[PDB]
Design goal:
homodimer, 412 residues, alpha/beta, Peroxisomal Thiolase, Chain A, domain 1, 2 domains, ten-stranded mixed sheet, two-stranded antiparallel ribbon, 13 helices, 33% helix, binds the ligand Cc1c(NC(=O)c2cccc(N)c2)c(=O)n(-c2ccccc2)n1C, transferase (chains A, B), Thiolase-like (chains A, B), lipid metabolism (chains A, B)
Chain lengths: 412, 412
């Protein structure tokens, strides 16, 4: 290709806000989005807190008719997608609608809806399943409903790669544009796994923090007292656009997407190898894709989930890739504040990466009181750090050892 | 790119067989794979038949330890993937494992496992959820478990685009190889939605045939008495390989993958527009990708699900794209025999497309007794038709109006 890809529009729901500016304000203030869960009774569970979207009003986006048919993960993905498209200023016409597609994924999809239809099935039999159960619960219906609501006729699909989803969604959408199969893609991810099955499922694996006494301190990536991830909900969407297309309509450009890498660990179903060899291969692939040397990276938005094995692997991988420069770049985990948004994590963190470029500021890793053995990089502990950022990398790693990296650059 | 992509290995579980040769034998004989469902009691449901995989032994592939942790859709996907890799003859080493990835998707994933964990949750509370619930049920764990079992460290992901899944999986894997991010990909899809939630879910939408009296006649694409699709299970995987890579190891090449197209209808959540305008755009995209004129296509493996709206739309789209040549090509739906394998449909049908090329034979559309108004193409009614096939197209269309087309060519 010679086709450059830029970001023209962003949208988000997160535990820190109902839109990108409100969430980013929270990020730069070191605010926690984590609180006891209000929407179900978790008094019998080992983890009773997480990152909820607070005060979401679906009727800002959808009729009550439409919304009642859709699982919350679809509601969230559509909210982020609609926010991003509005933010971009793009006008969809007959001249361009075939060139505009969508790639919004989810890691687990409509778990709450499935749980509710299961209850109906078991209590009252299969005729009590909703007729809207399938199209309201399956992962590709963020892409599907968005394309229908906006008349988008370009490439229409959905990734599901666990915690990597939102990163792969964005990366593969950028490939579509570079290849010429679209001029614009709305890409990202959404998740709402905070139901009994979800919390129970992650809890049954002993994967979650159980710091119920201080939920805001629970997510502490690279801290020696970390004890598992914090489950969070929400969504992130970006409008990706071919550069000449964006220039021709006078779009506001946030940043350029210059590289995308993937790898597989081929190691274990849930733990990475302790040296993060797969993550290293992934990061190198993304830099090679971008035509960048490691020394050109200024900011890493780490995956950094607050797990024992995961966090130290990612340090090892950054040291392996970056060598001495690993001590010059700034690296932080915004999951310290947002928790782990699962399929949406990579989408929200890409947005935070783009804003780090816009605002020339590395967001903090809050709660990093006692860095663990070998966690001796600049992890932007405690407080946001204004600094020079030309290039920002964002990593996501997922169950199965599936890895993704995005590389963004200031646009000039 | 200049990088050509060829098919070196194929694997399948279907209602017609436990491997590709057994299934293909069934296809060319016009055999139905549809029967009353045996593994649950459907006497209270409106549809009590479907296409099951019969006599599957997971212990040919996995230990009983491993297998008990995985939903049947994962079991099936791994079986097809292992069959394809074995079929290819490729040997994985340290020199190539970073260049070999996987893209196996699913439309709905681990529904049976979810249903079972829901029962445990409701009866006995969240501590009775399996610790293996999440990694045994999520869609990306075919990719994940395969990469771990074979040591594959290339691009590792999963599509979920409803009935389009297996087509998009193959197409996007081919893009990986063309782009240079892999030399080999194992790609396709798997599905096992035959549980109460699944049958109940599709039934609640009145989407399924209810011809319980003659299950083998239920799937009748383009027949005027068609009354909905037939739910089927199974999987299909292909080993896609860069041409020089395949040549250098003396691989047996089945066919070349020359084009991949996508589109969105942007019309309705489950029905296509009656003129199949989206499908037409998709097919044209795939031919444009392949550098082919419509007149070069000899065989279409139609999506052809046996629904009222879907089947006639696809006829309209073929007539729009192909013009007079629409009466020269042969087009058939193998779902007449296999039923609708959902996320796997496009993967099995790609395999049937490749074999149509190998064997120079268009598989039949069985049950096409009374073609509906305007269904006046060569639909290979009743009996397989030996003929010249240089180019074979395979379509898949999905909920949300998501479309995909693959174009294969005899390799010379
Ligand atoms: C903790 C976690 C995952 N894993 C990670 O973050 C993770 C972190 C470091 C290394 C690796 N290889 C993965 C994930 O993929 N999750 C998920 C599951 C189902 C659906 C959506 C996400 N979860 C919960
Ligand atoms: C009947 C059917 C679908 N649709 C189609 O085949 C279909 C056929 C013609 C046109 C269009 N646009 C779609 C599908 O996407 N399904 C699915 C749902 C959930 C998961 C997996 C597949 N089903 C059941």
């Amino acid at each position: 290709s010679r086709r450059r890809v830029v970001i023209t529009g962003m949208g988000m729901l997160s535990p820190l806000g109902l839109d990108v500016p409100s969430s980013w304000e929270g990020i730069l203030a070191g605010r926690s989005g984590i609180a006891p869960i209000e929407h179900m009774d978790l008094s019998a569970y080992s983890t009773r807190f997480g990152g909820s979207v607070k005060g979401f009003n679906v009727e800002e986006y959808l009729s009550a008719k439409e919304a009642r048919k859709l699982d919350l993960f679809i509601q969230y993905g559509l909210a982020a997608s609609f926010q991003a498209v509005r933010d971009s200023g793009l006008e969809v016409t007959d001249a361009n609608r075939e060139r505009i597609g969508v790639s919004m994924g989810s890691g687990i999809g409509g778990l709450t809806n499935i749980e509710n239809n299961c209850r109906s099935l078991f209590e009252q039999g299969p005729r009590r399943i909703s007729p809207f159960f399938v199209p309201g619960s399956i992962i590709n219906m963020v892409s599907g409903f968005l394309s229908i609501h906006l008349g988008l006729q370009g490439p229409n699909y959905a990734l599901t790669t666990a915690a990597t989803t939102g990163t792969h969604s964005i990366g593969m959408a950028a490939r579509n544009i570079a290849y010429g199969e679209a001029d614009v893609m709305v890409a990202g991810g959404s998740e709402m796994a905070a139901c009994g099955l979800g919390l129970g499922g992650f809890g049954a694996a002993r994967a979650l923090s159980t710091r119920n006494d201080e939920p805001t301190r629970a997510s502490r990536p690279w801290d020696r007292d970390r004890d598992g991830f914090v489950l969070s909900d929400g969504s992130g969407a970006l409008v990706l656009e071919e550069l000449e297309h964006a220039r021709a309509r006078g779009a506001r450009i946030y940043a350029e997407l210059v590289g995308f890498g993937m790898s597989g660990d081929a190691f274990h179903m849930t733990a990475p190898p302790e040296d993060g060899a797969g993550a290293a291969r992934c990061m190198k692939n993304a830099l090679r894709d971008a035509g960048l040397d490691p020394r050109q990276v200024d900011y890493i938005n780490a995956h950094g989930t607050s797990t024992p094995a995961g966090d130290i692997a990612e340090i090892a991988a950054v040291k392996s890739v970056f060598g001495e420069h690993a001590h010059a770049l700034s690296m932080s985990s915004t999951k310290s504040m947002t928790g782990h948004l699962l399929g949406a994590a990579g989408a929200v963190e890409a947005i935070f990466s783009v804003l780090a470029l816009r605002d020339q500021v590395a967001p903090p890793t809050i709660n990093l009181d006692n860095p663990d053995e070998g966690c001796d990089l600049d992890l932007v502990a405690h407080e946001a750090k204004p600094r020079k950022i030309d290039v920002a990398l964002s990593n996501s790693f997922g169950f199965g050892g599936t890895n993704g990296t995005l590389v963004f650059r200031r646009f000039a």
